[PDB]
Design a protein around this ligand. Sequence first.
Ligand code: MG
Ligand code: MG
Ligand code: MG
Ligand code: MG
Ligand code: MG
Ligand code: MG
Ligand code: MG
Ligand code: MG
Ligand code: MG
Ligand code: MG
Ligand code: MG
Ligand code: MG
Ligand code: MG
Ligand code: MG
Ligand code: MG
Ligand code: MG
Ligand code: MG
Ligand code: MG
Ligand code: MG
Ligand code: MG
Ligand code: MG
Ligand code: MG
Ligand code: MG
Ligand code: MG
Ligand code: MG
Ligand code: MG
Ligand code: MG
Ligand code: MG
Ligand code: MG
Ligand code: MG
Ligand code: MG
Ligand code: MG
Ligand code: MG
Ligand code: MG
Ligand code: MG
Ligand code: MG
Ligand code: MG
Ligand code: MG
Ligand code: MG
Ligand code: MG
Ligand code: MG
Ligand code: MG
Ligand code: MG
Ligand code: MG
Ligand code: MG
Ligand code: MG
Ligand code: MG
Ligand code: MG
Ligand code: MG
Ligand code: MG
Ligand code: MG
Ligand code: MG
Ligand code: MG
Ligand code: MG
Ligand code: MG
Ligand code: MG
Ligand code: MG
Ligand code: MG
Ligand code: MG
Ligand code: MG
Ligand code: MG
Ligand code: MG
Ligand code: MG
Ligand code: MG
Ligand code: MG
Ligand code: MG
Ligand code: MG
Ligand code: MG
Ligand code: MG
Ligand code: MG
Ligand code: MG
Ligand code: MG
Ligand code: MG
Ligand code: MG
Ligand code: MG
Ligand code: MG
Ligand code: MG
Ligand code: MG
Ligand code: MG
Ligand code: MG
Ligand code: MG
Ligand code: MG
Ligand code: MG
Ligand code: MG
Ligand code: MG
Ligand code: MG
Ligand code: MG
Ligand code: MG
Ligand code: MG
Ligand code: MG
Ligand code: MG
Ligand code: MG
Ligand code: MG
Ligand code: MG
Ligand code: MG
Ligand code: MG
Ligand code: MG
Ligand code: MG
Ligand code: MG
Ligand code: MG
Ligand code: MG
Ligand code: MG
Ligand code: MG
Ligand code: MG
Ligand code: MG
Ligand code: MG
Ligand code: MG
Ligand code: MG
Ligand code: MG
Ligand code: MG
Ligand code: MG
Ligand code: MG
Ligand code: MG
Ligand code: MG
Ligand code: MG
Ligand code: MG
Ligand code: MG
Ligand code: MG
Ligand code: MG
Ligand code: MG
Ligand code: MG
Ligand code: MG
Ligand code: MG
Ligand code: MG
Ligand code: MG
Ligand code: MG
Ligand code: MG
Ligand code: MG
Ligand code: MG
Ligand code: MG
Ligand code: MG
Ligand code: MG
Ligand code: MG
Ligand code: MG
Ligand code: MG
Ligand code: MG
Ligand code: MG
Ligand code: MG
Ligand code: MG
Ligand code: MG
Ligand code: MG
Ligand code: MG
Ligand code: MG
Ligand code: MG
Ligand code: MG
Ligand code: MG
Ligand code: MG
Ligand code: MG
Ligand code: MG
Ligand code: MG
Ligand code: MG
Ligand code: MG
Ligand code: MG
Ligand code: MG
Ligand code: MG
Ligand code: MG
Ligand code: MG
Ligand code: MG
Ligand code: MG
Ligand code: MG
Ligand code: MG
Ligand code: MG
Ligand code: MG
Ligand code: MG
Ligand code: MG
Ligand code: MG
Ligand code: MG
Ligand code: MG
Ligand code: MG
Ligand code: MG
Ligand code: MG
Ligand code: MG
Ligand code: MG
Ligand code: MG
Ligand code: MG
Ligand code: MG
Ligand code: MG
Ligand code: MG
Ligand code: MG
Ligand code: MG
Ligand code: MG
Ligand code: MG
Ligand code: MG
Ligand code: MG
Ligand code: MG
Ligand code: MG
Lengths: 138, 124
Amino acid sequence: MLTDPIADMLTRIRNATRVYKESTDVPASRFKEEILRILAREGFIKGYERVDVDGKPYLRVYLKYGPRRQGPDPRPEQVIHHIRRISKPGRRVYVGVKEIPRVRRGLGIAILSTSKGVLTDREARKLGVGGELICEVW
Amino acid sequence: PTINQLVRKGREKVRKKSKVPALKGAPFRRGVCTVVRTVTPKKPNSALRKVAKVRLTSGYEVTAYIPGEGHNLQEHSVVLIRGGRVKDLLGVRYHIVRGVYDAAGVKDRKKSRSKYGTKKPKEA
RNA sequence: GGCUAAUCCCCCAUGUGGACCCGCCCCUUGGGGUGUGUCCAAAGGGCUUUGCCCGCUUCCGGAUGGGCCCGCGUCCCAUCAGCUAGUUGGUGGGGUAAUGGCCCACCAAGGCGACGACGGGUAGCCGGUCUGAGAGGAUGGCCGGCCACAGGGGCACUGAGACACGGGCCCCACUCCUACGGGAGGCAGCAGUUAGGAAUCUUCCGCAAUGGGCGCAAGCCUGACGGAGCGACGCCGCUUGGAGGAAGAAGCCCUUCGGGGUGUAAACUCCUGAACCCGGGACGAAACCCCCGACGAGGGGACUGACGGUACCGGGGUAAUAGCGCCGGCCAACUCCGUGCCAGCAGCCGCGGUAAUACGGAGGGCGCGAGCGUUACCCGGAUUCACUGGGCGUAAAGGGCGUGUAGGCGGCCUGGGGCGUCCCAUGUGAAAGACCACGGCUCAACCGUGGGGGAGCGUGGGAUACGCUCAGGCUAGACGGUGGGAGAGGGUGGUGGAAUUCCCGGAGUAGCGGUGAAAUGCGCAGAUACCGGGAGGAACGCCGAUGGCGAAGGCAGCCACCUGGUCCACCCGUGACGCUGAGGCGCGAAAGCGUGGGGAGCAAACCGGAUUAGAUACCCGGGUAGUCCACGCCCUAAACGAUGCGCGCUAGGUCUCUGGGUCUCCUGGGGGCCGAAGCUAACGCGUUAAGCGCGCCGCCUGGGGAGUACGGCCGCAAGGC
RNA sequence: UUCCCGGGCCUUGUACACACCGCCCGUCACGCCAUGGGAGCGGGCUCUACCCGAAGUCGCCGGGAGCCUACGGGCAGGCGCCGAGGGUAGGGCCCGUGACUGGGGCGAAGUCGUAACAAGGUAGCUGUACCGGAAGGUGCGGCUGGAUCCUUUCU
Ligand SMILES: [Mg+2]
Ligand SMILES: [Mg+2]
Ligand SMILES: [Mg+2]
Ligand SMILES: [Mg+2]
Ligand SMILES: [Mg+2]
Ligand SMILES: [Mg+2]
Ligand SMILES: [Mg+2]
Ligand SMILES: [Mg+2]
Ligand SMILES: [Mg+2]
Ligand SMILES: [Mg+2]
Ligand SMILES: [Mg+2]
Ligand SMILES: [Mg+2]
Ligand SMILES: [Mg+2]
Ligand SMILES: [Mg+2]
Ligand SMILES: [Mg+2]
Ligand SMILES: [Mg+2]
Ligand SMILES: [Mg+2]
Ligand SMILES: [Mg+2]
Ligand SMILES: [Mg+2]
Ligand SMILES: [Mg+2]
Ligand SMILES: [Mg+2]
Ligand SMILES: [Mg+2]
Ligand SMILES: [Mg+2]
Ligand SMILES: [Mg+2]
Ligand SMILES: [Mg+2]
Ligand SMILES: [Mg+2]
Ligand SMILES: [Mg+2]
Ligand SMILES: [Mg+2]
Ligand SMILES: [Mg+2]
Ligand SMILES: [Mg+2]
Ligand SMILES: [Mg+2]
Ligand SMILES: [Mg+2]
Ligand SMILES: [Mg+2]
Ligand SMILES: [Mg+2]
Ligand SMILES: [Mg+2]
Ligand SMILES: [Mg+2]
Ligand SMILES: [Mg+2]
Ligand SMILES: [Mg+2]
Ligand SMILES: [Mg+2]
Ligand SMILES: [Mg+2]
Ligand SMILES: [Mg+2]
Ligand SMILES: [Mg+2]
Ligand SMILES: [Mg+2]
Ligand SMILES: [Mg+2]
Ligand SMILES: [Mg+2]
Ligand SMILES: [Mg+2]
Ligand SMILES: [Mg+2]
Ligand SMILES: [Mg+2]
Ligand SMILES: [Mg+2]
Ligand SMILES: [Mg+2]
Ligand SMILES: [Mg+2]
Ligand SMILES: [Mg+2]
Ligand SMILES: [Mg+2]
Ligand SMILES: [Mg+2]
Ligand SMILES: [Mg+2]
Ligand SMILES: [Mg+2]
Ligand SMILES: [Mg+2]
Ligand SMILES: [Mg+2]
Ligand SMILES: [Mg+2]
Ligand SMILES: [Mg+2]
Ligand SMILES: [Mg+2]
Ligand SMILES: [Mg+2]
Ligand SMILES: [Mg+2]
Ligand SMILES: [Mg+2]
Ligand SMILES: [Mg+2]
Ligand SMILES: [Mg+2]
Ligand SMILES: [Mg+2]
Ligand SMILES: [Mg+2]
Ligand SMILES: [Mg+2]
Ligand SMILES: [Mg+2]
Ligand SMILES: [Mg+2]
Ligand SMILES: [Mg+2]
Ligand SMILES: [Mg+2]
Ligand SMILES: [Mg+2]
Ligand SMILES: [Mg+2]
Ligand SMILES: [Mg+2]
Ligand SMILES: [Mg+2]
Ligand SMILES: [Mg+2]
Ligand SMILES: [Mg+2]
Ligand SMILES: [Mg+2]
Ligand SMILES: [Mg+2]
Ligand SMILES: [Mg+2]
Ligand SMILES: [Mg+2]
Ligand SMILES: [Mg+2]
Ligand SMILES: [Mg+2]
Ligand SMILES: [Mg+2]
Ligand SMILES: [Mg+2]
Ligand SMILES: [Mg+2]
Ligand SMILES: [Mg+2]
Ligand SMILES: [Mg+2]
Ligand SMILES: [Mg+2]
Ligand SMILES: [Mg+2]
Ligand SMILES: [Mg+2]
Ligand SMILES: [Mg+2]
Ligand SMILES: [Mg+2]
Ligand SMILES: [Mg+2]
Ligand SMILES: [Mg+2]
Ligand SMILES: [Mg+2]
Ligand SMILES: [Mg+2]
Ligand SMILES: [Mg+2]
Ligand SMILES: [Mg+2]
Ligand SMILES: [Mg+2]
Ligand SMILES: [Mg+2]
Ligand SMILES: [Mg+2]
Ligand SMILES: [Mg+2]
Ligand SMILES: [Mg+2]
Ligand SMILES: [Mg+2]
Ligand SMILES: [Mg+2]
Ligand SMILES: [Mg+2]
Ligand SMILES: [Mg+2]
Ligand SMILES: [Mg+2]
Ligand SMILES: [Mg+2]
Ligand SMILES: [Mg+2]
Ligand SMILES: [Mg+2]
Ligand SMILES: [Mg+2]
Ligand SMILES: [Mg+2]
Ligand SMILES: [Mg+2]
Ligand SMILES: [Mg+2]
Ligand SMILES: [Mg+2]
Ligand SMILES: [Mg+2]
Ligand SMILES: [Mg+2]
Ligand SMILES: [Mg+2]
Ligand SMILES: [Mg+2]
Ligand SMILES: [Mg+2]
Ligand SMILES: [Mg+2]
Ligand SMILES: [Mg+2]
Ligand SMILES: [Mg+2]
Ligand SMILES: [Mg+2]
Ligand SMILES: [Mg+2]
Ligand SMILES: [Mg+2]
Ligand SMILES: [Mg+2]
Ligand SMILES: [Mg+2]
Ligand SMILES: [Mg+2]
Ligand SMILES: [Mg+2]
Ligand SMILES: [Mg+2]
Ligand SMILES: [Mg+2]
Ligand SMILES: [Mg+2]
Ligand SMILES: [Mg+2]
Ligand SMILES: [Mg+2]
Ligand SMILES: [Mg+2]
Ligand SMILES: [Mg+2]
Ligand SMILES: [Mg+2]
Ligand SMILES: [Mg+2]
Ligand SMILES: [Mg+2]
Ligand SMILES: [Mg+2]
Ligand SMILES: [Mg+2]
Ligand SMILES: [Mg+2]
Ligand SMILES: [Mg+2]
Ligand SMILES: [Mg+2]
Ligand SMILES: [Mg+2]
Ligand SMILES: [Mg+2]
Ligand SMILES: [Mg+2]
Ligand SMILES: [Mg+2]
Ligand SMILES: [Mg+2]
Ligand SMILES: [Mg+2]
Ligand SMILES: [Mg+2]
Ligand SMILES: [Mg+2]
Ligand SMILES: [Mg+2]
Ligand SMILES: [Mg+2]
Ligand SMILES: [Mg+2]
Ligand SMILES: [Mg+2]
Ligand SMILES: [Mg+2]
Ligand SMILES: [Mg+2]
Ligand SMILES: [Mg+2]
Ligand SMILES: [Mg+2]
Ligand SMILES: [Mg+2]
Ligand SMILES: [Mg+2]
Ligand SMILES: [Mg+2]
Ligand SMILES: [Mg+2]
Ligand SMILES: [Mg+2]
Ligand SMILES: [Mg+2]
Ligand SMILES: [Mg+2]
Ligand SMILES: [Mg+2]
Ligand SMILES: [Mg+2]
Ligand SMILES: [Mg+2]
Ligand SMILES: [Mg+2]
Ligand SMILES: [Mg+2]
Ligand SMILES: [Mg+2]
Ligand SMILES: [Mg+2]
Ligand SMILES: [Mg+2]
Ligand SMILES: [Mg+2]
Ligand SMILES: [Mg+2]
Ligand SMILES: [Mg+2]
Ligand SMILES: [Mg+2]
Ligand SMILES: [Mg+2]
Ligand SMILES: [Mg+2]
C-alpha cells in the first residue's frame, strides 16, 4: 500500500525527470489527474494521458526538458527544477486565503486543494479561497 | 523524530548553570577576608598571584582575585566581590573591587583607573 | 439602680402593590399570568407654612456593580504511578441572594489516572514588555484589569455590600504598661527610624485643579491627588564657543640628525553672549454662589492658587566644565622607554624566561562624550532541542530479536452528512502600548485628536477538493485455495564410523615425552612404538562453498517421527481484512547460579618445571570448577551490516543458490562483486541505498567525572534495567 | 645478500608529528576542593490513630433553679456537635551539624613497572569468570575495528 499516493506521484515524476525519461506511469486517481491537469496547464509537463497496464489504469506523464547544453555535462536544464509535498498524512497543512505562499517570488506554483477544487496559488487568491496546501513546484 | 513523536514527547529546553553563586542574583557581594595568600598558577604559566579567601554576606566562602599591582588587604579587612574568573588559577571565580571598602585603589597607576579604582591625578 | 427625646424599636389601620401555600392558563429547569385564602408598609424635618423643598413607604422597570456555573488556554520532575471516605452518585433536609456533598442524615458503590491522576518543586495571572527576520525564547517593575493578603491561625457580628488593613471575639509569637491581679498594641497607608543588603528618596507644599465621603447649602474631611525636593537611575533637548590665525612658537614625543608629530591646536585678532543681574509676568479657572427667569432652559454676571514671581516675553551681560574605555586577533586605533616565567594582563586564542605594537608609564591614535567602563541577569547570535530549521555505517545517536495492546498512519469508484477545512456576515478582541496621520509644549522626549490593524472565541449563512464519517461498489495491497520445490529452521527418539583416554591380553626393550634449548613428568611394578579385545564420554573428517536455513541468539554424521518459516506456478476464493507499534509478554551466544546426573579430551583457580633483572606471564608437565545432560534461574555482548520495520520509485554488468519457462536466454525469490543517476566530511553507499519519497517506533545533543552516586524495580547470588 | 652499520625506491600499519632517544597506561607516596556513605544528633513541615480543646456560628434544655412579659414568647444561663491549636505514638519530606569512610579530578614531581599505539614484541577489543604489587594475566564464547606467506626494559 502506498501510504501517500500523491507524494508517490510527485516522486515518480521527480525520479523520472532526473534520469531524463520521456514519460512515466503513475497509478491513477481523479485527484492525481487534477494535480496533473494543473502541471500541464502550468507548463511543467508536456501533459498526460490515461493508459491501462495489465488491465489496471495508470497515467502517463510526459516529461518536459530544456535544450541540450555546452561544455561538460550536456544534459538539459529541468523544467521542474523542484517538486515537493507540503501537506502529508500525519502532518496536514491548511492555509487560509491570506496564508497562501508566494512561491519562488512567483516563478513557481503552490497547488492547493479547495472546496472550489484544485487550484494554483494565484488561482486561489483570485478565487479568494483557502485550503489544503498540497505541492510546491518550481 | 516523526511529528507524532514530537507531539508525544517534544523538544527539551536547555537549562544553564550559573557560573557565579554570589547567590542573591546580586551583581556584587560584600565579604570579609580570611586568608590572604599567594598562589601558584596553572601549568602553562608561572607567577605569584594574590588571592584572598572570603566569607560573604551570603553565607558563602570563596577565594577572590586581587587585581592591580599593590594591595593593602589583610586578614580581617572587608571587601567587595565582583565576579569573573582567572583562567589559570584553580577554583577562583570572583574578583576583588579596588577602591571599595578596605580595598585600596592602585597607587601611582595612571592608565585605566576606572578598573583598579584609583582617582584622577592633578597636573599643573 | 433612676429620668428622657427622636427620621431609634414595637402594635392595630389602609393593600396601590407584594410575599407565601393550593388550583388553572401560557411558558418551559425556579420565566409569566391568574383566583381564593393567610401575611407585609411608612417619619418626619426646613422654609416665606393655603405651597414648595430635603426626606420616608410598598412595587415594577432601568442603570451600574457584583455572586455562582460551564468550554477552552495557562511552568518543571515519572529517580512522583497509582490516587480517593464527603470520596462518587442518590432520596430527604439544613444553609444562602442564589446552584451545589456547601453542610447533615439515610441509601447505593462509586469517581479520577500514562490524554500524566496523586506526589514534589517553583510561581500571583493578564493587557503587555525585552529580544528575535520570523516561528520562538524570556519576563509581568512602573501605568490599566483581575485575584489574594493586612504579625501568624481560626471565627463570626453589623450591613445593600465584609467574614472587614487604620472594626470586633479567641489562640500563638513578639514589644510595651503593670499596685503582679490584669491590661495596650499591629505603617504591605504618606513621610521618617532601625535592621538586613551591592542598593532604592522629603518626618516638604497645597486642597488652586481632578476625583471621593457626608451636607439643602454655606462648608468640613481627603498623605487619592496636584505639585515641589533629593539620586546622570532612564529618555529627550542644551552648553563648555564662532570666524580668522604659521607652510606652521615653546614644551613633550619619535628620528635614518636631513627632520616627522602634537597642529589652526595654542598665543593673538575680531564677533556672538551659557551663566548672571534688572524689569513685566502667566495659562492652568469657571463652576459651586449671586441676580434676571419658575431654584429648569436660556441669558447674563462677581469670588476662587499649592506650583510661584516659577514658565515665558522685554532689557542688560561675561569666552565661559571634560571625561571615560580602548589601541595583538576577533576589532577602529602604534610607536619609544621601562620591566625580563618577575611584576603583571586575560572574554576565548593566549601574552611576559632582553629588540614585549598583549605587562607598566609616556607620546600619538581610535571610540563614545555628561558621560564612559564593570559586574549580575534576559533574548540574540544558537539552524547548539531544528514547527519554521538538525541528526543516528565509522563523529553523540537503531532498542539483542520478536509478538502484539494503546496510539499514530491508510488503495480505487460512487453517494449521504458537513466534524475537521475554507469563505462571507455579525458580535467580542476595554483603555493605555504598538503602527499611521495630523497636532500641543520654540524642538524633541512627553502629550492630545483621529485612522487603520489584529490572532482567538461566540452566532448566522455558504462551499465540498482534501481529512473524517455513514452507506454501497472494486481488486492492483493483504490473506486464502490447488499443485510443485530447496533448506545445518526447531523438538523427540534411535544408530554409525574416526580419534583420544582408560582397562584386559599378546609381542617386544630402554627409553618416551617435551622445548629455542631444557627441566619437571612418565618408564624395570616393563612405559613409548605395534597387534587384538572391552569400557566410556565428547565432537562429527571428506562432502563444505566466496554455500544454505532462521526474527535474532544461532543451526553441520546418519535414520525416523512431531513441527515452524519460506519461494515459485496456476489467476481459483475473500474483498482493504492493511503498516508501524510506547507498555506488556516471549525468545535470547558465552560465562555465571541452584538441585540432581555425568566426566573421555580440554581446562579459570591451583600445583610444579623453565625463562627472566624479577616471571606472579607468555613456553613445558599436571590439575579443580567448568565444558556435557535434565529441570529451574541469570538477560548480558564488537547480541555488528557497529546500518529499526514496511511500501513505491530510480542504468547496467558479472558470479552464484533456488523455483518456473518457448531452458542462445527470459522470468520470480535469495547470496555476493563492480558500477548510472544520485548521496556522502571523506572512506564509501549505489534495485540486498547510506539514492528519491511516505508512514510508524527507538535513540542523540562537548569530553572527563560515570554506566559511577542516590532512588526505584528485577535477581538465590553474581549482578542487571 | 642471511646477518651487523649507513642508505635509496614501492608498499602496509600507527594513538607518532620537537616525529620510536616518540606516545601513553596504572600503583604507591605526596600537594587540593567537591562528593556520597555517614551512626546518631539539633530542629522545621506534613500524614495517621487516640486524648485535651479557646473563640464563634448552629442544635437542644431554658425547670415553684434567675430577669422581662400583653403569658404568645424573649434574654441570661447550661449542655452538645463542629472546631484554631496542644499532647501521646509511630510513617515520610526537608535544612544545619556530623564519628566514619569510597573513589574522584587535576595538582612540585618523585616511584616501580611496560599494559595499549608498528605483527607495540604473547594481534587487539569484548560480555563474563577466577586470579594478581600495579598497568594486567588466564579460562569460555564472540568481534575485526588484525598485520604480513624462547625471552631481551628505559630516555
Ligand atoms: Mg469525488
Ligand atoms: Mg490531457
Ligand atoms: Mg511546513
Ligand atoms: Mg437602667
Ligand atoms: Mg443605666
Ligand atoms: Mg416614658
Ligand atoms: Mg421604623
Ligand atoms: Mg398591618
Ligand atoms: Mg392586589
Ligand atoms: Mg404561579
Ligand atoms: Mg389575593
Ligand atoms: Mg409612627
Ligand atoms: Mg431595582
Ligand atoms: Mg454576571
Ligand atoms: Mg512560572
Ligand atoms: Mg535521585
Ligand atoms: Mg473525611
Ligand atoms: Mg455521611
Ligand atoms: Mg433512597
Ligand atoms: Mg439538596
Ligand atoms: Mg450575608
Ligand atoms: Mg484527558
Ligand atoms: Mg512567573
Ligand atoms: Mg510565592
Ligand atoms: Mg515585539
Ligand atoms: Mg521588534
Ligand atoms: Mg513575540
Ligand atoms: Mg508569554
Ligand atoms: Mg508568564
Ligand atoms: Mg503585578
Ligand atoms: Mg499593576
Ligand atoms: Mg474580573
Ligand atoms: Mg492570612
Ligand atoms: Mg510587617
Ligand atoms: Mg510571623
Ligand atoms: Mg491574620
Ligand atoms: Mg448600609
Ligand atoms: Mg478583622
Ligand atoms: Mg479578607
Ligand atoms: Mg495601619
Ligand atoms: Mg483589644
Ligand atoms: Mg543602612
Ligand atoms: Mg547597612
Ligand atoms: Mg517621587
Ligand atoms: Mg502641610
Ligand atoms: Mg479638592
Ligand atoms: Mg470638590
Ligand atoms: Mg449630594
Ligand atoms: Mg440655606
Ligand atoms: Mg484630619
Ligand atoms: Mg504625587
Ligand atoms: Mg554619583
Ligand atoms: Mg554612578
Ligand atoms: Mg577657531
Ligand atoms: Mg614645536
Ligand atoms: Mg617642531
Ligand atoms: Mg559684546
Ligand atoms: Mg487662571
Ligand atoms: Mg481664564
Ligand atoms: Mg464667572
Ligand atoms: Mg428669584
Ligand atoms: Mg445657566
Ligand atoms: Mg451662566
Ligand atoms: Mg471652591
Ligand atoms: Mg505666587
Ligand atoms: Mg534675555
Ligand atoms: Mg542682546
Ligand atoms: Mg577660552
Ligand atoms: Mg585591527
Ligand atoms: Mg589592560
Ligand atoms: Mg631593558
Ligand atoms: Mg625594548
Ligand atoms: Mg620575546
Ligand atoms: Mg604596548
Ligand atoms: Mg590587548
Ligand atoms: Mg598597554
Ligand atoms: Mg592620549
Ligand atoms: Mg544627553
Ligand atoms: Mg551604564
Ligand atoms: Mg544566549
Ligand atoms: Mg532558537
Ligand atoms: Mg535564529
Ligand atoms: Mg550550548
Ligand atoms: Mg525538524
Ligand atoms: Mg509554526
Ligand atoms: Mg547534528
Ligand atoms: Mg571510535
Ligand atoms: Mg557510534
Ligand atoms: Mg540492531
Ligand atoms: Mg547499541
Ligand atoms: Mg489499531
Ligand atoms: Mg485516502
Ligand atoms: Mg462545517
Ligand atoms: Mg450541501
Ligand atoms: Mg471578527
Ligand atoms: Mg487598542
Ligand atoms: Mg499614555
Ligand atoms: Mg505615545
Ligand atoms: Mg509626530
Ligand atoms: Mg509641533
Ligand atoms: Mg497616541
Ligand atoms: Mg489612539
Ligand atoms: Mg479599533
Ligand atoms: Mg461559524
Ligand atoms: Mg457555520
Ligand atoms: Mg454536498
Ligand atoms: Mg463526499
Ligand atoms: Mg475520502
Ligand atoms: Mg481512523
Ligand atoms: Mg466497503
Ligand atoms: Mg473477484
Ligand atoms: Mg497468494
Ligand atoms: Mg486450482
Ligand atoms: Mg501448497
Ligand atoms: Mg536441521
Ligand atoms: Mg574407540
Ligand atoms: Mg600391556
Ligand atoms: Mg622415576
Ligand atoms: Mg627389573
Ligand atoms: Mg616408582
Ligand atoms: Mg609381558
Ligand atoms: Mg584398540
Ligand atoms: Mg569412565
Ligand atoms: Mg562404543
Ligand atoms: Mg570446509
Ligand atoms: Mg554461512
Ligand atoms: Mg517443513
Ligand atoms: Mg508447477
Ligand atoms: Mg480473481
Ligand atoms: Mg466477488
Ligand atoms: Mg510488527
Ligand atoms: Mg515492545
Ligand atoms: Mg541466556
Ligand atoms: Mg551456558
Ligand atoms: Mg551448574
Ligand atoms: Mg554439579
Ligand atoms: Mg591437559
Ligand atoms: Mg597448562
Ligand atoms: Mg609458575
Ligand atoms: Mg560448585
Ligand atoms: Mg562459585
Ligand atoms: Mg538451561
Ligand atoms: Mg531512519
Ligand atoms: Mg509484517
Ligand atoms: Mg546483481
Ligand atoms: Mg531451469
Ligand atoms: Mg537478486
Ligand atoms: Mg536469509
Ligand atoms: Mg560501489
Ligand atoms: Mg558518480
Ligand atoms: Mg540526504
Ligand atoms: Mg528501500
Ligand atoms: Mg549517511
Ligand atoms: Mg559534561
Ligand atoms: Mg556524560
Ligand atoms: Mg556494567
Ligand atoms: Mg540502586
Ligand atoms: Mg533482594
Ligand atoms: Mg551488590
Ligand atoms: Mg559488571
Ligand atoms: Mg544489591
Ligand atoms: Mg638496513
Ligand atoms: Mg631506486
Ligand atoms: Mg618519495
Ligand atoms: Mg591496525
Ligand atoms: Mg600515514
Ligand atoms: Mg616528540
Ligand atoms: Mg606516573
Ligand atoms: Mg598513609
Ligand atoms: Mg464552646
Ligand atoms: Mg447538632
Ligand atoms: Mg421562660
Ligand atoms: Mg445560649
Ligand atoms: Mg473533635
Ligand atoms: Mg494534633
Ligand atoms: Mg573525603
Ligand atoms: Mg607494551
Ligand atoms: Mg596484551
Ligand atoms: Mg601485544
Ligand atoms: Mg603466545
Ligand atoms: Mg594467571
Ligand atoms: Mg579473557
Ligand atoms: Mg579468544
Ligand atoms: Mg582490530
Ligand atoms: Mg629482561
Ligand atoms: Mg620510565
